[PDB]
Design a binder for this molecule. Sequence first.
Ligand SMILES: Cc1cc2nc3c(=O)[nH]c(=O)nc-3n(C[C@H](O)[C@H](O)[C@H](O)COP(=O)(O)O)c2cc1C
Ligand SMILES: Cc1cc2nc3c(=O)[nH]c(=O)nc-3n(C[C@H](O)[C@H](O)[C@H](O)COP(=O)(O)O)c2cc1C
Ligand SMILES: Nc1ncnc2c1ncn2[C@@H]1O[C@H](COP(=O)(O)OP(=O)(O)OP(=O)(O)O)[C@@H](O)[C@H]1O
Ligand SMILES: Nc1ncnc2c1ncn2[C@@H]1O[C@H](COP(=O)(O)OP(=O)(O)OP(=O)(O)O)[C@@H](O)[C@H]1O
Lengths: 364, 364
Amino acid sequence: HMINAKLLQLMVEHSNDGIVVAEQEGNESILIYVNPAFERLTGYCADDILYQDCRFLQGEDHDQPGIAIIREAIREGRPCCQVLRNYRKDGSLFWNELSITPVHNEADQLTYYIGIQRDVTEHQQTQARLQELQSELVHVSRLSAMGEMASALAHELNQPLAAISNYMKGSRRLLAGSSDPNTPKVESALDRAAEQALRAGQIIRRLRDFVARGESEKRVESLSKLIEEAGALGLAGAREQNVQLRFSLDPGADLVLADRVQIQQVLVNLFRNALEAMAQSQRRELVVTNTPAADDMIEVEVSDTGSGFQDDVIPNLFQTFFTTKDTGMGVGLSISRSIIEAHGGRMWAESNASGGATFRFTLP
Amino acid sequence: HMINAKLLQLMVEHSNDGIVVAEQEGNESILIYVNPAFERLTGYCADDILYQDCRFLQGEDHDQPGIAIIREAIREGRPCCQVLRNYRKDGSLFWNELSITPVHNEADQLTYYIGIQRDVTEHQQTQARLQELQSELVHVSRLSAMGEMASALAHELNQPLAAISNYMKGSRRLLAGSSDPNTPKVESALDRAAEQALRAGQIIRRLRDFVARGESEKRVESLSKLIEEAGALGLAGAREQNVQLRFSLDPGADLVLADRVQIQQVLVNLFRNALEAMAQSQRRELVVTNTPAADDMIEVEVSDTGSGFQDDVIPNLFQTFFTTKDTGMGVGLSISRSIIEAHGGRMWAESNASGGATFRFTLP
Ligand SMILES: Cc1cc2nc3c(=O)[nH]c(=O)nc-3n(C[C@H](O)[C@H](O)[C@H](O)COP(=O)(O)O)c2cc1C
Ligand SMILES: Cc1cc2nc3c(=O)[nH]c(=O)nc-3n(C[C@H](O)[C@H](O)[C@H](O)COP(=O)(O)O)c2cc1C
Ligand SMILES: Nc1ncnc2c1ncn2[C@@H]1O[C@H](COP(=O)(O)OP(=O)(O)OP(=O)(O)O)[C@@H](O)[C@H]1O
Ligand SMILES: Nc1ncnc2c1ncn2[C@@H]1O[C@H](COP(=O)(O)OP(=O)(O)OP(=O)(O)O)[C@@H](O)[C@H]1O
């Protein structure tokens, strides 16, 4: 009609997408045409797999929810789109997105099917990794948050509880030189008061290390990889708010010794902090840069042109619970600073020439 | 090469996927064939859009990154796959996935292109909302974890600190009827000891309500909608780990009064907990069901066939910090029960007949 059928077949033959045509034979949907893209996608030759049902690509994996959906859609004659785990000739696993359209041929009085097949292995794998990274980030966020919470309340209670015990020791000394008949009752009451104060010390340390159970070591980590992993989580919104991203990396300064989950959470917090500071900024530029620093250490810098720092803010930063945000907890930077220094580096902040914020840290 | 080109054209014509053929004319890739699927996808008639470049679907939206990728891929003759913001005839926006394959016809000495076009508007939208839900979950996880923590250490310290103040009041009472010369010194020391206890009392509530700032809003919420949002986060792996999902919902008993972020986080925890319990299970079945239930309420049930509960476990459940997991906090169920009861319902647990766990809650 619009185009020669010979040309249309030529396009299908050379399409980069897997395209097959199948023929209904009872409970079989036997292949009657496959294009070279389908031969590459599946690793099979056309002369081998023709005139049998495509379900052989599943091989052994039959507990897939999409299989029943396809069978019902074929039984109803309606099209369908499902993702299945298929296996190529060499046995390698790929996820195959099947777009199947049942078509009825009047000339044959027979039912055919056209299937467009696309490899979504790369989509499934990066998505599955993001769910790992999302659950990993949530887990370490909750653990470290209560960790900073526990050390904060412990240190802030350290002074009043110690004062209580000091007043007990002083009162007991005053009561030592006493002959009053009620003195032993007072001394016993002061004893139990001292015990309860010490027990409060026991309690806070007990619930502190209940959320600190499970701690890690360090390993060789690629900065490129962890910057990309942290960016996938923390920088997902740059395009919608027009933040210009620049990752300036040093190939000579790419491998560091770091525990990947702690540096991930530092960068996620820095990335999110930077996006928030640039919400109302006219210039929106985020730069990440690595250089060797200290004496045979390596420094990573993340600078923004965001809302920046008032004169009083910078020295109140990296301090537990300090925040300028209505809903901020002010623990992100405090946890981050402790993490970088525990890795053998230093972490600090400064205003940049554009009125924004610059954070630096070093890693070995 | 295996089927008649007329039959192959018949399949392309009736494919549920948009399939077009274009012809290179300098910097133009003019349409020479579109199938009815593309006419429905684009809302245009074939007689209208033939023999012009498909770029009219972009309209004015030319600040799309895929346009440069497609233009260069066409210039190089290599295939490409990009998603673009296109607008149909009525002006409504849809996201279009373009698989373009440049093909060379020797008979013409001309370059053609075959394009498979599918509407991915829903995929892009559910993914963008999923990115929102992930950041939303991280935010409230850290907030609520320190929130249930703030009440936790306060409740465990409530007894020793109250005892300290009571022993101060009792000691002062004993010292009232005393003539010993050192008594006024003792009384003054006991006063400051009591003051430090009260100051420690202030401290825990102060650091408690620093994380209680954003805590107290409610709203009308759809259970169907929030179950799907929670499922997107918590149940993302059911298909890939072969968990059978069944949501048996009643549309007449679907709308409840609930604060959506807190119930979402309750469900996310239940969904992840259920997947973990079925990690080593031979039968993997997850059932979510809503029914009318109480004198004013509607009940939602989440049942699994997972590892279930040892005989001693259930009575320590819904209790803060009780966990059977090496890395667990044991606050999820505790936070969940407080959230559901604050929303006017009740929450409890029981073992099911398959050896797994069943959780129920009700909402108005
Ligand atoms: C045109 C067409 C193409 C198909 N391609 C594939 C495929 O590439 N991989 C696959 O695992 N199943 C594929 N299937 C699905 C199988 O043909 C089969 O219908 C499905 O596994 C469910 O059928 P069953 O319930 O009889 O197993 C395709 C089906 C049709 C109609
Ligand atoms: C076969 C084919 C189909 C195309 N279909 C679409 C389409 O449906 N929507 C769209 O926005 N662009 C589509 N394009 C892309 C445009 O034709 C154009 O190449 C693109 O906008 C980049 O070229 P330009 O930089 O000259 O605009 C298609 C291209 C080809 C070759
Ligand atoms: N990129 C930045 N630009 C400007 N100010 C920043 C930037 N990053 C952090 N800050 C400042 O640091 C303060 C503390 O931030 P921090 O990361 O510790 O926590 P937060 O963002 O307030 O809260 P939360 O713990 O919920 O993430 C913020 O209130 C803000 O004033
Ligand atoms: N669906 C379930 N099947 C079996 N056991 C479960 C299920 N849901 C919860 N549990 C049990 O309840 C215990 C407490 O769970 P809870 O939700 O309070 O926290 P958690 O999963 O241990 O930790 P976190 O709060 O960090 O997620 C778990 O250790 C687990 O043994």
